[PDB]
Amino acid sequence: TTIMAVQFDGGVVLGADSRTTTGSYIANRVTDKLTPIHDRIFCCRSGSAADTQAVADAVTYQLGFHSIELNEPPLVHTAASLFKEMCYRYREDLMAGIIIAGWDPQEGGQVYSVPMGGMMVRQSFAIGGSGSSYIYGYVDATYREGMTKEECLQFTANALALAMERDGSSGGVIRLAAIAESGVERQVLLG
Amino acid sequence: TGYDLSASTFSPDGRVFQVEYAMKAVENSSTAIGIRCKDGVVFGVEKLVLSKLYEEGSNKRLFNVDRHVGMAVAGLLADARSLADIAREEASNFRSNFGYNIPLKHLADRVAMYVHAYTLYSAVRPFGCSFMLGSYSVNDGAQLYMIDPSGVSYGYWGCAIGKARQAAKTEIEKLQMKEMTCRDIVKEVAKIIYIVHDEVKDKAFELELSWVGELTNGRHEIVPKDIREEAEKYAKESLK
Amino acid sequence: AERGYSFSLTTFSPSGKLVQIEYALAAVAGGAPSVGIKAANGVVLATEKKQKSILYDERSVHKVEPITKHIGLVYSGMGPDYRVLVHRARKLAQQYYLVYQEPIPTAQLVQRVASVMQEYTQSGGVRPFGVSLLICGWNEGRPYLFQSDPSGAYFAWKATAMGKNYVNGKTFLEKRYNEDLELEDAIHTAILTLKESFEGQMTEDNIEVGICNEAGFRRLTPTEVKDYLAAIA
Amino acid sequence: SSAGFDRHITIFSPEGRLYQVEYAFKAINQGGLTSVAVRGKDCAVIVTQKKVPDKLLDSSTVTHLFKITENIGCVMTGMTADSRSQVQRARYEAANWKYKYGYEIPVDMLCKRIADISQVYTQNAEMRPLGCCMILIGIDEEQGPQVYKCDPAGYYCGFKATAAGVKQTESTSFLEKKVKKKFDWTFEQTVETAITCLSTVLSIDFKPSEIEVGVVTVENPKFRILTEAEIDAHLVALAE
Amino acid sequence: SKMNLSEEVDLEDYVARPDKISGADINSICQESGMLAVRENRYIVLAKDFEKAYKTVIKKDEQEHEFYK
Amino acid sequence: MADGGSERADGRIVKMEVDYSATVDQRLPECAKLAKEGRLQEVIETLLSLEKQTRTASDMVSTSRILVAVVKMCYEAKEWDLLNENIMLLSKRRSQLKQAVAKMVQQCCTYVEEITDLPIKLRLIDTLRMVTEGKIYVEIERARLTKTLATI
Known part of the structure; x- marks a missing residue:
């Protein structure tokens, strides 16, 4: 549920929770919210799982046939434009929790947030999740400008731990995702 | 004996007569050439004069499909404006769903799938237009592609269609092309443009020139005659 | 007249014979020999596949393409339009299987396919199928072997043969094969009539013998083909 | 035999033969290219070339190497116009199987789904048969590499090593004797024999920059495919 | 037998590949196969002499159709 | 290449008499790269002869002693090698081998009278295959005739 995206100079760093709860009952104890669209382009999903999977599968088919025909690097901004057009037309039906964060050869690491309205905007950091209401004051203070990939794993762990421990929906094991020119990096942390 | 009737059928020599008639159909039209420098791409069009004929600066074969892309076309003019709107509508689909500049490689590929398709069916007919596609971008660079009515997609540093003179592209290797900044290039091409295509065939003529590249920051427009004026300035004194 | 959507190109000759459909029989005659035998417990098929060059490996392309687990089949003559009706029969055999809940007999494959195959010949603008299908399998405890033609007419033969010199191999299958025999004896005379027009070289990849068991169709690998036929028949 | 207007459309003949389809034999001759496929134990190697009549030819744009999937590429022959329309269709059904099925693609039976669309091209009422010839490689799990060459009659074809085209008939003659006998195949062994099989045909043996050698190994x-670097080293390795 | 031996030259490969391209074009093209031995320039006819003789006449153009075999 | 063959060969002529035979064996890779190019027409025929010139000047040195002709079987090692990488295709410019071999057998004409027949027949058994490789090409056929008359 709770999702986080932070961009540093040479890429972006993503994180998400595992435990997902439908009502009072827990649907799944361990769930990976990151979507492997492409090696250089990831996103974080929330809300309805069925709506986030198919749209990610649609862009994978759309861009996949397009990007392979390009024989070009996987441009991040154009991939997020496919989410912008679809979430805007379906905004009265589909629910959009996708936030596109990925490293690009030309434009570097960038984060694009696409809320339920379908708009696309670039910011230095991204926030999301139901448990993010309590950390809104914490994310607007502890966050610093010009972060490093090292401390990005620490800061995303501080933002998720406060949201997962307080809010009842978010929880489980903490999983982080690091994106840079060296490729995809994932890890499992707890406590 | 009638093997040239259906455009969907082959020929006793194993080729398409509809395309063979379409290749020379573009040759009878006036010459429209193109060339690309390092930071830019240059276009040109010849305008023939028989009687008057009409106002200068009319029905020029130079068209602008997109911000960074342009059209140098030859052959039947009405078939070119139809492909100009198709390329314009295709450029509208790219700027909508995506919102950035359409790469010249796949922009020529979309038209390559079209021009090829009309040659396959006997219902419709092939195209009598062989045009030039070129563009420049900061993240791409200068490319130039030569499209033929048969539907083959490819490009060189330069190509020539229209009338068969072909001597206007000879002096280009005698001058600096990829080394030059594309500024003086405009007036360097126009020298033999006037010399060759002798006045015996056509008494008078008129020349159009267009350019797209870094100096315009990716924009494409026809170079005005008053600015920088050195286009036809150096062209008159270079005839010898 | 009308559209140009490919109205029927098939007309009637002054004697009433079909024009382009009878020409598809020439492709069957100018094709490759394929034989099959309906005897006793099940049906046995013997086809012929020979490589035009030494660089061809028969382990990839398979002549036998069974429609159902219990239904085998082979063909004669002409591939490109053959795979069209094959996969079409895969989609068509599902309505009988989903609605009636049953391993559809070969007789129903004959009625449905030959009707569409006849409708395909009636539709113009397209060349009729030059493929003569041998339909076999096991249903209701008694197997069947049925032969179709480009025109759609379906027959029933104990031992049948198609391809080059099919009238000569039909007389051999009329004499050497009679009444009914076991599947092992059926494979014997099925290769002997295939070795008629076959070249002087017979290996595991030169001939492939399919068999329809009462338990359902089982396609034999080239292993069992070289074991029984070496030493052909 | 021929009667009536059958010469002017695509259909059968009074003798049951074909004319249009058989005129596609020499449809490759106008291109005048050659492609030979050689497969090894763990590897498969394709050899092709291109013609450079003018120095303006760009190596990237006129490149005849087409890449369908990251794991599986391809190559074409004949006129390049009909080939490009089949390129996206080979990419289309590819992405369909990557999306829906999610694994290494029908390394064996993919030529059936492609030839089906290629047969639709031939089976259409009035349309061009598209005589371009499709050639694919393949990668499977513990099956070793695969090589497949499809022809635009609507059928699927592929084997260990196959060469079909203008001059490819003499190339297979050497491959029949070279493979067996009995022999194995290594990486450089298949690259070295890619030239020798063509050496029985023409092999002008000039600078490798014009020839393109496709290679896939597990x-x-x-x-x-590399660029220009060790392909020349494999060219001087086979000649001692 | 009228050709020079051919005690070295092995008839095995010439009864296969040249047999594919035969017209026929039967009787005296085999004599042309011997009339390319006078083209030599070689004491005992080379393998390239035979193969070159039959491959010129007559040509075949394949295969989009007969592939059913 | 023309200039490449003149600068390397004329600079290695001092290595023969003054320096040891190690540089003579180390002379192989550079002179081979010159023949790998094949810039021809007749230049490399004269270029590689300058090697074969001082190489026959080393025949005075080496083949006399020391000793046993093992240095000569190393010569045919790089005689076969010199024809390996060119490949020269029995051309053009293959005459660099004729005058070489003709001067090689000219030394063999002096060896039979100067030294016993044992080392020269091991030298003659090597050039029997050199003639099979030397065709049928010009005088190499009659260089076979003069050496086989000596064997009789």
Whole structure:
């Protein structure tokens, strides 16, 4: 549920929770919210799982046939434009929790947030999740400008731990995702 | 004996007569050439004069499909404006769903799938237009592609269609092309443009020139005659 | 007249014979020999596949393409339009299987396919199928072997043969094969009539013998083909 | 035999033969290219070339190497116009199987789904048969590499090593004797025999920059091709 | 037998590949196969002499159709 | 290449008499790269002869002693090698081998009278295959005739 995206100079760093709860009952104890669209382009999903999977599968088919025909690097901004057009037309039906964060050869690491309205905007950091209401004051203070990939794993762990421990929906094991020119990096942390 | 009737059928020599008639159909039209420098791409069009004929600066074969892309076309003019709107509508689909500049490689590929398709069916007919596609971008660079009515997609540093003179592209290797900044290039091409295509065939003529590249920051427009004026300035004194 | 959507190109000759459909029989005659035998417990098929060059490996392309687990089949003559009706029969055999809940007999494959195959010949603008299908399998405890033609007419033969010199191999299958025999004896005379027009070289990849068991169709690998036929028949 | 207007459309003949389809035999001759496929134990190697009549030819744009999937590439012959329309269709059904099925693609039976669309091209009422010839490689799990060459009659074809085209008939003659007998195949052994099989045909033996050698070997399953570097080293390795 | 031996030259490969391209074009093209031995320039006819003789006449153009075999 | 063959060969002529035979064996890779190019027409025929010139000047040195002709079987090692990488295709410019071999057998004409027949027949058994490789090409056929008359 709770999702986080932070961009540093040479890429972006993503994180998400595992435990997902439908009502009072827990649907799944361990769930990976990151979507492997492409090696250089990831996103974080929330809300309805069925709506986030198919749209990610649609862009994978759309861009996949397009990007392979390009024989070009996987441009991040154009991939997020496919989410912008679809979430805007379906905004009265589909629910959009996708936030596109990925490293690009030309434009570097960038984060694009696409809320339920379908708009696309670039910011230095991204926030999301139901448990993010309590950390809104914490994310607007502890966050610093010009972060490093090292401390990005620490800061995303501080933002998720406060949201997962307080809010009842978010929880489980903490999983982080690091994106840079060296490729995809994932890890499992707890406590 | 009638093997040239259906455009969907082959020929006793194993080729398409509809395309063979379409290749020379573009040759009878006036010459429209193109060339690309390092930071830019240059276009040109010849305008023939028989009687008057009409106002200068009319029905020029130079068209602008997109911000960074342009059209140098030859052959039947009405078939070119139809492909100009198709390329314009295709450029509208790219700027909508995506919102950035359409790469010249796949922009020529979309038209390559079209021009090829009309040659396959006997219902419709092939195209009598062989045009030039070129563009420049900061993240791409200068490319130039030569499209033929048969539907083959490819490009060189330069190509020539229209009338068969072909001597206007000879002096280009005698001058600096990829080394030059594309500024003086405009007036360097126009020298033999006037010399060759002798006045015996056509008494008078008129020349159009267009350019797209870094100096315009990716924009494409026809170079005005008053600015920088050195286009036809150096062209008159270079005839010898 | 009308559209140009490919109205029927098939007309009637002054004697009433079909024009382009009878020409598809020439492709069957100018094709490759394929034989099959309906005897006793099940049906046995013997086809012929020979490589035009030494660089061809028969382990990839398979002549036998069974429609159902219990239904085998082979063909004669002409591939490109053959795979069209094959996969079409895969989609068509599902309505009988989903609605009636049953391993559809070969007789129903004959009625449905030959009707569409006849409708395909009636539709113009397209060349009729030059493929003569041998339909076999096991249903209701008694197997069947049925032969179709480009025109759609379906027959029933104990031992049948198609391809080059099919009238000569039909007389051999009329004499050497009679009444009914076991599947092992059926494979014997099925290769002997295939070795008629076959070249002087017979290996595991030169001939492939399919068999329809009462338990359902089982396609034999080239292993069992070289074991029984070496030493052909 | 021929009667009536059958010469002017695509259909059968009074003798049951074909004319249009058989005129596609020499449809490759106008291109005048050659492609030969050689497969090894763990590897598969394709050899092709291109013609450079003018120095303006760009190596990237006129490149005849087409890449369908990262793991599986391809190559074409004949006129390049009909080939490009089949390129996206080979990419289309590819992405369909990557999306829906999610694995290494029908390394064996993919030629059936492609030839089906290629047969629709032939089976259409009035349309061009598209005489371009499709050639694919393949990668499977513990099956070794695969090589497949499809022809635009609507049928699927592929084997260990196959060469079909203008001059490819003499190339297979050497491959029949070279493979067996009995022999194995290594990486450089298949690259060295890619020239020798063509050496029985023409092999002008000039600078390698014009010839393109496709290669796929299983270490990293992703298909890929180097640029100009060690291809010349493999050319001087086979000649001692 | 009228050709020079051919005690070295092995008839095995010439009864296969040249047999594919035969017209026929039967009787006296085999004599042309011997009339390319006078083209030599070689004491005992080379393998390239035979193969070159039959491959010129007559040509075949394949295969989009007969592939059913 | 023309200039490449003149600068390397004329600079290695001092290595023969002054320096040891190690540089003579180390002379192989550079002179081979010159023949790998094949810039021809007749230049490399004269270029590689300068090697074969001082190489026959080393025949005075080496083949006399020391000793046993093992240095000569190393010569045919790089005689076969010199024809390996060119490949020269029995051309053009293959005459660099004729005058070489003709001067090689000219030394063999002096060896039979100067030294016993044992080392020269091991030298003659090597050039029997050199003639099979030397065709049928010009005088190499009659260089076979003069050496086989000596064997009789």
